[PDB]
Amino acid sequence: TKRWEGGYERTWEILKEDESGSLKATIEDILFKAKRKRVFEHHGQVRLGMMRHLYVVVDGSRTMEDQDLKPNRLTCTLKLLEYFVEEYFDQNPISQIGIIVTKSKRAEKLTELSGNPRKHITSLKKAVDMTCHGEPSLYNSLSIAMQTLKHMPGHTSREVLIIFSSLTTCDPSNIYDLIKTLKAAKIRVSVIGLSAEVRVCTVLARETGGTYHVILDESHYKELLTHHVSPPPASSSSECSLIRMGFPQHTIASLSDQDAKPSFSMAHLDGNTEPGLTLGGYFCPQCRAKYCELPVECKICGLTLVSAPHLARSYHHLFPLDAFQEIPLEEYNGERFCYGCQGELKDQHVYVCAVCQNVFCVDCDVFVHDSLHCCPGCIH
Amino acid sequence: SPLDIYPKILDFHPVTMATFTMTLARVCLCPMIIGRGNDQVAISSKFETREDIAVIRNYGNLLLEMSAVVPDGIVAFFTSYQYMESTVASWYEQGILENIQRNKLLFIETQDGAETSVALEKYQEACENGRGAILLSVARGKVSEGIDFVHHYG
Amino acid sequence: KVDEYGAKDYRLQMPLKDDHTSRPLWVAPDGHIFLEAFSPVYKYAQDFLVAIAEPVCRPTHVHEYKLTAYSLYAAVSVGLQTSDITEYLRKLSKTGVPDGIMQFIKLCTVSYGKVKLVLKHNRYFVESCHPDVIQHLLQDPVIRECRLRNSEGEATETVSFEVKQEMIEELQKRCIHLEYPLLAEYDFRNDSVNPDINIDLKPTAVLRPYQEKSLRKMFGNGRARSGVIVLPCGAGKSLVGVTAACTVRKRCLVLGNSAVSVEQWKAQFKMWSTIDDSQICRFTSDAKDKPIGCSVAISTYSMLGHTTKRSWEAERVMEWLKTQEWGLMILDEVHTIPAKMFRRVLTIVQAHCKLGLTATLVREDDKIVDLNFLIGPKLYEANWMELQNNGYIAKVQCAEVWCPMSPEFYREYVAIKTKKRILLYTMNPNKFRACQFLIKFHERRNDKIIVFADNVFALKEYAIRLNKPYIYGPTSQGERMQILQNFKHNPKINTIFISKVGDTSFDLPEANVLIQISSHGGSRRQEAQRLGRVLRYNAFFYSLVSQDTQEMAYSTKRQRFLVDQGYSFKVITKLAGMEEEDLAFSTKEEQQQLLQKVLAATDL
Ligand SMILES: [Zn+2]
Ligand SMILES: [Zn+2]
Ligand SMILES: [Zn+2]
């Protein structure tokens, strides 16, 4: 049989009248039910993460000159890569990104593996005017990625992302041995092709544990990149994994005090133009090196400089707020004012925290569970 | 396909005349017939036009720009060994076969059984990785029915 | 009733406004329903009103529905009874039901199941539960010719008699005039006379909830009745027909309008029904895939109603086809059913259920009312606004941008009146510049463009000027097919011109920009169909008209259907960057040269 071949649904039977005007109670109930449409979780997915050293491999062959994506594959790929880098650094505080470009059967490490977002974006913008020639070489790119990631600590999740536009790759040696070596190195490899499915890419993704996808259009490309943004799940406890990192306070300098000390920035010193000799900035807690951007690993002492709010923004996942107990207004024998907004309690249901036993209205409960992530009563 | 010619080619009395077409969640095959080329000239393998330069150039261009869209192996069939060798010689004479070579590897099937076997083996091993390859053969050859081009092959 | 301000005022008629505003509904004495969309009970009220009345306008805030006899017949066809509908209408009134609506509803709903029309052994019979109505309609002179030979009393069991097969339309037309409407209910669950086929749709063709409502309303109590389902072309229309055919599980007949729509229906069946090619046959004198002995047969109009000598193979196929019953005869593009030759196609074949599907039910010559008894009542009418709000239909930003008439053309426009002015405002240089600017702007952003244009004579110089592909319309079959095939998967070419050919249900690929110039006179159906070719602000379509010409009135009068559907036409008077780049007809020399070639027609 079929679900639609039975009886016609009569949804209007829900409403009923008993006092010639009780429809107001029904519409009030409908309005109350309309709220609380969320699961009280902004993400609802992975509640933790792990440090990722992600390498992005970009094809630079003649196939990038194709105009499947306006204006050409290279420009759209670089723009979406800039967006991906921005989002990935936004959602990963202590992750690192390296960029490799394959061209003319060779691989060039365009950018070093680091956590600076501006440097990667600058390199990508510079690479827009490159020359597309030759054929890609997956073997060389994977060899470079493995050599760079061979010495990385085990607790970090080593991931390699390949954007393969051309359907042909030139390998100076056997590639399956390299795939076995990568599998022994526990390196995750994911490939996002553009033209069609390639057997070698699928085999590599399956053996290394990654995912292989093929782009349908620019929207699908962006969706795949956004899916790759999310960090992989992490084990409960792996090893003694830690890292010595500093928290440089943003100490500016004012000429009113006698300690107005100008200093050239370490990052700006390598530029062709005159480095910005600003009044102040971020001073390294270890060697007093001055930096303008964060998070940037210190050039002098090798210390990692991170911003504390960025790390703290994900702390609510570690200690999620328990759902409040829903109690009807009639059954609660106490104050009729919300503890959070001081508003009068007129809703049919009142929510009470299990810890401090305070009273919160529907709006305040939703605000606490969605944005505040902390019970105001428990703070006191 | 013709169920009316087999009963009369050999003395036969069929009572079935039954055909079946496979169906899947998606169309697994995309047959298409290519007529005139980019020059609006027919690419028919006519006997009077076997030595024609235009048709050979169109065939080479089709095999070139086709080799860059379908990866990991393309199986091409020609009318005869003589026509196949005359076509590949003309392609080698022009600066066109190198463009196909730099995309996919070219393997030619010959009458030698051992040579054909080793050519098939190297074609398979080249299609295993991302190099890709082209297998040129003849319709009326022992390699046409001796092997099956399973998925990811051809 | 009073005309103090020229408005029909019924303040005194319905004062029942007890408490206070919770019912989002208003009734009218003669008949009308007003619904407030911004109410918490909006969905339930919509579900109730759709099953009982058809809409007349669906803007963003206040919907307006109309009560008709056929709407009440459809409502009582479903399990809803008189008491339920009356009590729920009174439940949500906020003003009180006038004592002119209850009587009308009672009269409409009382005489619903009294008379039925049934088909058995290739014989049409009329069966009545109450024997008195047989004598009541016996005195009607027109009914007496249906019986042959005079059908004494057909004493069975319940009084019935046979009727003439070729004159079934006349008795159907007379019965509603006699306030005894006929119903076409086919209880396919228990037939045991029909060789039910093994059709079964694959369990992977999921359907949206809006199609679920229409399908459920079609099968209310285990039986299928004839009706009309209106869904947009971009939405899923053929899927509903395929699902209905699978559920009926009987021999299906599909009728299309064009010789290419039969291929579309065959593809839909091959995609969402899991039926072997042996059973599926197309009868259009093109391949002749042995239509004799088939489960589902797909053909087109203008061939089942031939008034001339028919082909020998076609004659034999028609003779075979007119000798057996059909289950769920499916009609496509039902809006153009009430024609001189298309109506008799219904009477030339015998079928139990007649299911008609269309996207643009609007038609001139007020022949849609005839379709109420030709096939059945208006079953489902999709709400396009909420359909596009779900994101499954492209939110097309409708535009109505006009261009001033150039002086070199307006003198000739006002000088001539003998129908020669059609080309004049069609070939307006300003409209040409606006169209070229829109084409270039949308090509610079890589958007697919379809340009509709009637008056193919103008379209010739309109398309050859820009050196762009165009479909004259009688070009060929292959050329149009290859042009449309390479139109979608080619970045080099993304704009085509169509001359009234795209005014039906074709396989045109997805497009985002539509620019129509010099369309038909007042065909709301044509504009609705053209708008349907874009949806599938994801997209937007423009209409170009010439000011101070009949095109202004035509565009105003042909958009009243879409505004009832909820679309709003923003007026654009200035185009940004008109002089930024170079366009055709920049100087007056070529503009005045155009006058000689546009007056060179002289078709006398
Ligand atoms: Zn330092
Ligand atoms: Zn509160
Ligand atoms: Zn608390």
Swiss-Prot record, chain A:
- Which UniProt keyword terms apply here? DNA damage, DNA repair, Host-virus interaction, Metal-binding, Nucleus, Phosphoprotein, Transcription, Transcription regulation, Zinc, Zinc-finger
Query: Between which residues do disulfide bridges form?
Result: none
Q: In which tissues is it expressed?
A: Widely expressed, with higher expression in skeletal muscle.
What are the protein's GO molecular function terms? RNA polymerase II general transcription initiation factor activity; zinc ion binding
Any one Pfam family match given in the protein's UniProt record, by short name:
Ssl1
Start and end residues of each C4-type zinc finger? 284-301
- UniProt effect for mutating C375A: No effect on the transcriptional activity of the reconstituted TFIIH complex
What SMART domains does the record tag this protein with?
Answer: C1_4 (SM01047), VWA (SM00327)
Compartment annotation: Nucleus
Post-translational modification Phosphotyrosine, affected residues:
Y88
Q: Which family does it belong to?
A: Belongs to the GTF2H2 family.
Q: What is this protein called?
A: General transcription factor IIH subunit 2
Swiss-Prot record, chain B:
Q: What is known to happen upon mutating L24P? A: In XP-D; the corresponding mutation in fission yeast causes complete loss of activity
Q: Where is this region: Mediates interaction with MMS19?
A: 1-154
User: What does UniProt say on post-translational modification here?
Assistant: ISGylated.
Role played: ATP-dependent 5'-3' DNA helicase. Component of the general transcription and DNA repair factor IIH (TFIIH) core complex, not absolutely essential for minimal transcription in vitro. Required for transcription-coupled nucleotide excision repair (NER) of damaged DNA; recognizes damaged bases. Sequestered in chromatin on UV-damaged DNA. When complexed to CDK-activating kinase (CAK), involved in transcription by RNA polymerase II. In NER, TFIIH acts by opening DNA around the lesion to allow the excision of the damaged oligonucleotide and its replacement by a new DNA fragment.
**Written domain comment of the UniProt record:** Interacts with GTF2H2/p44 via the C-terminus of this protein; mutations in the C-terminal region of XPD do not alter its helicase activity, but prevent its interaction with and helicase stimulation by GTF2H2/p44.
Q: What family is this?
A: Belongs to the helicase family. RAD3/XPD subfamily.
**Quaternary organization:** Component of the 7-subunit TFIIH core complex composed of XPB/ERCC3, XPD/ERCC2, GTF2H1, GTF2H2, GTF2H3, GTF2H4 and GTF2H5, which is active in NER. The core complex associates with the 3-subunit CDK-activating kinase (CAK) module composed of CCNH/cyclin H, CDK7 and MNAT1 to form the 10-subunit holoenzyme (holo-TFIIH) active in transcription. Interacts with GTF2H2 (p44) which stimulates the 5'-3' helicase activity of this subunit. Component of the MMXD complex, which includes CIAO1, ERCC2, CIAO2B, MMS19 and SLC25A5. Interacts with CIAO1 and CIAO2B; the interaction WITH CIAO2B is direct.
The protein in question is named General transcription and DNA repair factor IIH helicase subunit XPD
Provide the species name.
Answer: Homo sapiens (Human)
From Swiss-Prot, chain C:
Q: What is its main location?
A: nucleus
EC number from the UniProt entry: 5.6.2.4
- What is the recorded post-translational modification? Dephosphorylation reactivates the 5'-excision step. Phosphorylation has no effect on transcription or the 3'-5' helicase activity.
Which effect does the record note for changing T68P? Answer: In TTD2; mild; wild-type dual incision, opening around damaged DNA and transcription by TFIIH
Question: Which catalytic reaction applies to this protein?
Answer: Couples ATP hydrolysis with the unwinding of duplex DNA by translocating in the 3'-5' direction; ATP + H2O = ADP + phosphate + H(+)
Q: Known activity regulation? A: ATPase activity is stimulated by TFIIH subunit p52 (GTF2H4). DNA translocase activity by this subunit in TFIIH is stimulated by XPA, ERCC5/XPG and XFP plus ERCC1; translocase activity is sensitive to triptolide which targets this enzyme.
**PANTHER family (alphabetical):** GENERAL TRANSCRIPTION AND DNA REPAIR FACTOR IIH HELICASE SUBUNIT XPB, RAD25/XP-B DNA REPAIR HELICASE
Q: What role does this protein play?
A: ATP-dependent 3'-5' DNA helicase/translocase. Binds dsDNA rather than ssDNA, unzipping it in a translocase rather than classical helicase activity. Component of the general transcription and DNA repair factor IIH (TFIIH) core complex. When complexed to CDK-activating kinase (CAK), involved in RNA transcription by RNA polymerase II. The ATPase activity of XPB/ERCC3, but not its helicase activity, is required for DNA opening; it may wrap around the damaged DNA wedging it open, causing localized melting that allows XPD/ERCC2 helicase to anchor.
The molecule here is called General transcription and DNA repair factor IIH helicase/translocase subunit XPB
Species in which this protein is naturally found: Homo sapiens
